Amino acid sequence: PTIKQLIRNTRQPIRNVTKSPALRGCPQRRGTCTRVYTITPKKPNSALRKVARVRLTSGFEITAYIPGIGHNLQEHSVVLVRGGRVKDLPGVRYHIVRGTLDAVGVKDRQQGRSKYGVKKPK
Amino acid sequence: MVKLRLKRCGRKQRAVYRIVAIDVRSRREGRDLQKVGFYDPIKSQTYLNVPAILDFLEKGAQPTETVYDILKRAEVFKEF
Amino acid sequence: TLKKADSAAKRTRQAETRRLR
Amino acid sequence: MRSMQGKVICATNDKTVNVEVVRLAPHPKYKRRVRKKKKYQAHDPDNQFKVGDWVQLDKCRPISKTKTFLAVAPEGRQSSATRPKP
Amino acid sequence: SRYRGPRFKKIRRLGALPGLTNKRPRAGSDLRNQSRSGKRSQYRIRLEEKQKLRFHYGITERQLLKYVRIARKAKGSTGQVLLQLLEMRLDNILFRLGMAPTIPGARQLVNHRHILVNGRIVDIPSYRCKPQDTIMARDEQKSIALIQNSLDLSPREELPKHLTLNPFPYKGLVNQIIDSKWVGLKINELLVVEYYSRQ
RNA sequence: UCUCAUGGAGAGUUCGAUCCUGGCUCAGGAUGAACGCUGGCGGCAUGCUUAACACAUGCAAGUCGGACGGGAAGUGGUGUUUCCAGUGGCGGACGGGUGAGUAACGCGUAAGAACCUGCCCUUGGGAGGGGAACAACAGCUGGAAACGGCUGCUAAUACCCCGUAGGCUGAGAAGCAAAAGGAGGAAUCCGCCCGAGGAGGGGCUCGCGUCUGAUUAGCUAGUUGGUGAGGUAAUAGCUUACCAAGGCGAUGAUCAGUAGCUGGUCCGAGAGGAUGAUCAGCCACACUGGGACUGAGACACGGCCCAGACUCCUACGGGAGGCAGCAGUGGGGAAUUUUCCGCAAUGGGCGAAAGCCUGACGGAGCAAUGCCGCGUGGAGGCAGAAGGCCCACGGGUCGUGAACUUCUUUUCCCGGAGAAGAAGCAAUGACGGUAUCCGGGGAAUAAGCAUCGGCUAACUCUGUGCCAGCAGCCGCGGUAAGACAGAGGAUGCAAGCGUUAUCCGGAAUGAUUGGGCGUAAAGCGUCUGUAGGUGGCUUUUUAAGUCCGCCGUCAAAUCCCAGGGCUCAACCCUGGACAG
Numbered sequence A: 001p002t003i004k005q006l007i008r009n010t011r012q013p014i015r016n017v018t019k020s021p022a023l024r025g026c027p028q029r030r031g032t033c034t035r036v037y038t039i040t041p042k043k044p045n046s047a048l049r050k051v052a053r054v055r056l057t058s059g060f061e062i063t064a065y066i067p068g069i070g071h072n073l074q075e076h077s078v079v080l081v082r083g084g085r086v087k088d089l090p091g092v093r094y095h096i097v098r099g100t101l102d103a104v105g106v107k108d109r110q111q112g113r114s115k116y117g118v119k120k121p122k
Numbered sequence B: 001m002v003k004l005r006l007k008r009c010g011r012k013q014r015a016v017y018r019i020v021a022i023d024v025r026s027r028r029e030g031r032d033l034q035k036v037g038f039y040d041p042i043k044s045q046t047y048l049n050v051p052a053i054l055d056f057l058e059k060g061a062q063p064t065e066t067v068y069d070i071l072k073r074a075e076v077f078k079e080f
Numbered sequence C: 001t002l003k004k005a006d007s008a009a010k011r012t013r014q015a016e017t018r019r020l021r
Numbered sequence D: 001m002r003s004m005q006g007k008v009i010c011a012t013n014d015k016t017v018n019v020e021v022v023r024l025a026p027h028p029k030y031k032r033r034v035r036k037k038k039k040y041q042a043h044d045p046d047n048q049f050k051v052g053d054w055v056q057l058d059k060c061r062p063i064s065k066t067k068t069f070l071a072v073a074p075e076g077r078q079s080s081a082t083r084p085k086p
Numbered sequence E: 001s002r003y004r005g006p007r008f009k010k011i012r013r014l015g016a017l018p019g020l021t022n023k024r025p026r027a028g029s030d031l032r033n034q035s036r037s038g039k040r041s042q043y044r045i046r047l048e049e050k051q052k053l054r055f056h057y058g059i060t061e062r063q064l065l066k067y068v069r070i071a072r073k074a075k076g077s078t079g080q081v082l083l084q085l086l087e088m089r090l091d092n093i094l095f096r097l098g099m100a101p102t103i104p105g106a107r108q109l110v111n112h113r114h115i116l117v118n119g120r121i122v123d124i125p126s127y128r129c130k131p132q133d134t135i136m137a138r139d140e141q142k143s144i145a146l147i148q149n150s151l152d153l154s155p156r157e158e159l160p161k162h163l164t165l166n167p168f169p170y171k172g173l174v175n176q177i178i179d180s181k182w183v184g185l186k187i188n189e190l191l192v193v194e195y196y197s198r199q
Numbered sequence F: 001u002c003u004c005a006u007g008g009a010g011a012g013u014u015c016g017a018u019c020c021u022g023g024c025u026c027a028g029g030a031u032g033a034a035c036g037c038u039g040g041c042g043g044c045a046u047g048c049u050u051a052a053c054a055c056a057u058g059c060a061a062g063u064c065g066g067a068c069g070g071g072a073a074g075u076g077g078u079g080u081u082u083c084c085a086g087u088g089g090c091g092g093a094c095g096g097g098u099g100a101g102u103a104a105c106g107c108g109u110a111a112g113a114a115c116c117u118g119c120c121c122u123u124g125g126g127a128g129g130g131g132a133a134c135a136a137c138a139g140c141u142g143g144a145a146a147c148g149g150c151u152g153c154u155a156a157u158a159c160c161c162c163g164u165a166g167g168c169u170g171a172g173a174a175g176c177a178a179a180a181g182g183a184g185g186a187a188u189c190c191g192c193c194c195g196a197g198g199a200g201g202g203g204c205u206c207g208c209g210u211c212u213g214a215u216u217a218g219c220u221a222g223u224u225g226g227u228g229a230g231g232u233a234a235u236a237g238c239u240u241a242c243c244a245a246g247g248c249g250a251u252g253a254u255c256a257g258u259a260g261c262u263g264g265u266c267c268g269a270g271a272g273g274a275u276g277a278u279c280a281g282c283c284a285c286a287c288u289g290g291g292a293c294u295g296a297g298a299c300a301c302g303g304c305c306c307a308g309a310c311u312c313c314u315a316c317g318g319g320a321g322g323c324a325g326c327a328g329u330g331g332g333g334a335a336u337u338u339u340c341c342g343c344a345a346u347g348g349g350c351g352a353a354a355g356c357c358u359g360a361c362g363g364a365g366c367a368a369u370g371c372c373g374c375g376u377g378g379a380g381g382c383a384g385a386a387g388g389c390c391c392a393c394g395g396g397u398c399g400u401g402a403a404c405u406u407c408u409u410u411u412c413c414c415g416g417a418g419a420a421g422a423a424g425c426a427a428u429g430a431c432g433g434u435a436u437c438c439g440g441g442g443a444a445u446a447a448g449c450a451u452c453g454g455c456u457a458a459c460u461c462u463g464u465g466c467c468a469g470c471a472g473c474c475g476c477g478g479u480a481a482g483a484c485a486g487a488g489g490a491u492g493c494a495a496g497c498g499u500u501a502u503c504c505g506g507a508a509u510g511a512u513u514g515g516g517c518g519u520a521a522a523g524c525g526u527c528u529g530u531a532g533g534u535g536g537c538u539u540u541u542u543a544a545g546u547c548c549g550c551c552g553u554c555a556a557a558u559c560c561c562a563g564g565g566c567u568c569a570a571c572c573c574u575g576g577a578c579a580g
């Protein structure tokens, strides 16, 4: 407000806080699943969601969502995780890229296939 | 010492030189004192600004072979 | 016998002798 | 360039003075002018200058780990001498 | 990088597009389901305008965008300068000179090295034509035959005053820069300029 | 109605509705990007951001026989000519890589005065007379090797002495100091020594500008100044002794934390925000620390010495080494290429020249990493037929779309010719028989990817039933789901299309331009007052701000304007300028 007051450095920005601290400034990271299990969604959304706990290369442990329908992942599997938030499940800030490393592609998905890591059918 | 030479500009396969007065120890495209001539083989384009050339040849700037013979064709060695 | 390091060696020895001078 | 005019804060030391120079600058963002004050070790042979003095400050070779400046007689200043009243 | 799809179709949705098709659309036969989207969002009006432009000249978007940057740069009325730029394309001039049936035709003509601009072969469609320029057919049997038949069998004498055509050798000549009234379509450039405020 | 302006968009979400304050979220740009699906071509660029973590192999700095003594290849022999270790000469201080350290005169800018300077110019004088060594070589000898040891031996542009010197010391008196020859038949050339200049390259000094933290408040004793002696190429607490008690600090000293800096790049309507890859300048570093030596120049990446850590070789006694040079291997990692060709061009080093060496550089190869161009056909095509899908069974729609008929051949294929880049004597081209040009076939060789509830362009049907799943936000999904999955259809982009990460925008949401504080977050409980900020009227002075003119500079490249060249564009080149 007062000029004299601004000249004392009274305007300072709020810095940009990341939504995915565990990645540490990366598009993806690789990790190993410590556990694979289901959680119930915050009400009123009832379902059973497929989440794994993944221990990363950057050392962290997180809880990543697994997309699509059904999966082959089990403990001591090596997967690739990416960012993005599942508004349902408290604390789950990361997905698991399908079709890479140890996660296979979703079976028999015909539409938007690149999002699930599936070949084109001939 | 001060040298009058070519610095290589333009692109891959198509090469175009400037003729420059620069200390002999700077890199081939490095910084210089004065820009003087312009040269180019493929367009057969060549020309020089002689007042500068002479003012540097006078303070003891040594040319490089190619340049030497460019100044020859343009008759700067006669005036000297 | 054939010795190749001109730069290093020769300059090192020269350095000794000149140093003593 | 232009030499720096100032006033003496400390005469106590020998062959030296400690000057304060005040300048105004247009602060980078907010466009108002500000007084920034800097101190200098000025070399003054003969120790002619006392505390409170208004002295012009000049540049020369290093005399010390600090004093680079020659203390010099006040350059031009408006006479505090009374003038006629027509 | 070219639109090889169904044309009539784009025409039903956009409007009238000369540089695409000479066949007037079917009655439209949508009068059965009577399906509409309701009306058009202001956004959809703008979008359809741009699309009109884009398909009339056979330009890709990423290209159109760069034309628009060139346009905002230029000192002058933006929509007008844009329309200039689009209308000076070699293939389009080749078309409006009746040297071609349609723009995909004209484009093909240019691609296959059948055209000359001032005694030199230009095979790229988007070559910008500048005033006082010679548009010739290459002197071979094929080139001449193409240009002759497509020029003669099409009657349209609408030549837009900046374009000269001369009879036996078939020398076309670009005289000057386009006028806003001589433009090759019914478009409010205003709408397109507006669509592009966000780039 | 002259002149300026080429620029500022919103939307959903608290409520039963409304208006507002306020956050979250979205639409746009940009990447040194990564991942998924898909992938025809060309043009110009780009390519270990993490571990300044380790390195197997090979190559990245030499040259001069016209300084010099030798011996080794030949030849018939010192007529010819080659190589070669050694002493000497210059060069290895440039070029190349990296960003760890550094909050500093390190960097940008603008000044200064006490300096240095090989090579290159310009100029003033010179080069007498002697002598002594040391490698090499020889002999003896020690070592697995690496590398040594004795005694002899020898040349020089290599060392030492004396004479002379427009210089140095000094108030002076005086004192003191130099040389080198090699070519050529001679002319002459390249050198050598001492001064005195020039330009360029370095060393210092200072104004200004140069991150976050007060839950970091006092810090500094060679520290701040003075003299005397030393020291440095030069000024200086640079050193040392004595004297004095200063210096810096709430306008943030010290301490902690992060960081190479700048031309620039990205974004912004602008004001300004974020950043510092390629490209160019400067700094700093070379396995981890410390020294110096040589030298015009180093405290020296491919030099020396020492200590340490680590790897290798060893016949066990000892040695060898430093990829953050070009390739390459392991390792870390989401992720970043060939153990390529060439000195032909430009630039360097040495040489009288011939020339030699250059992983600088010039080029190729690999990769849709990005930007730009082009293609995957063009014209005609009963309004008749198969099929998908929808349908109130009337018909609609995929769809002029295909099939089908002709034209064309960029690209593809098979043959031919075939550059400029090379510079003034010819010769000499890695790229490459590539770029381009002429012929012959033939629609022939080439379309995917997201989305379709609102923002947001694009809709129906079958399958599921709070399940399986979606989602950027609101939120969808319990029997007919325009929001899930499939189908058909549409829409957007297009050799790319999406998802994630990062930054600015929108955000007027840290507000100078541009907000607020009665009730929404927000006026100290109230005064007194120090620094600090602002402060009535009139005349004069001065000219620090302020304004106007002129000059210097703010490197080139980039951005902006005007032309020109690659068929166009990207990209390159010339010229010029507003800002500030």
Ligand SMILES: [Mg+2]
Pocket: none
């Ligand atoms: Mg944001």
Ligand SMILES: [Mg+2]
Pocket: B041
């Ligand atoms: Mg030529």
Ligand SMILES: [Mg+2]
Pocket: E001
């Ligand atoms: Mg393209």
Ligand SMILES: [Mg+2]
Pocket: none
């Ligand atoms: Mg489609």
Ligand SMILES: [Mg+2]
Pocket: E123
């Ligand atoms: Mg072509």
Ligand SMILES: [Mg+2]
Pocket: E197, E198
């Ligand atoms: Mg915008």
Ligand SMILES: [Mg+2]
Pocket: F014
């Ligand atoms: Mg409420």
Ligand SMILES: [Mg+2]
Pocket: none
């Ligand atoms: Mg509600």
Ligand SMILES: [Mg+2]
Pocket: none
């Ligand atoms: Mg608000």
Ligand SMILES: [Mg+2]
Pocket: none
């Ligand atoms: Mg975006």
Ligand SMILES: [Mg+2]
Pocket: none
């Ligand atoms: Mg692939």
Ligand SMILES: [Mg+2]
Pocket: none
């Ligand atoms: Mg690195």
Ligand SMILES: [Mg+2]
Pocket: none
């Ligand atoms: Mg090795």
Ligand SMILES: [Mg+2]
Pocket: F059
């Ligand atoms: Mg070699």
Ligand SMILES: [Mg+2]
Pocket: none
């Ligand atoms: Mg010889």
Ligand SMILES: [Mg+2]
Pocket: none
């Ligand atoms: Mg030789």
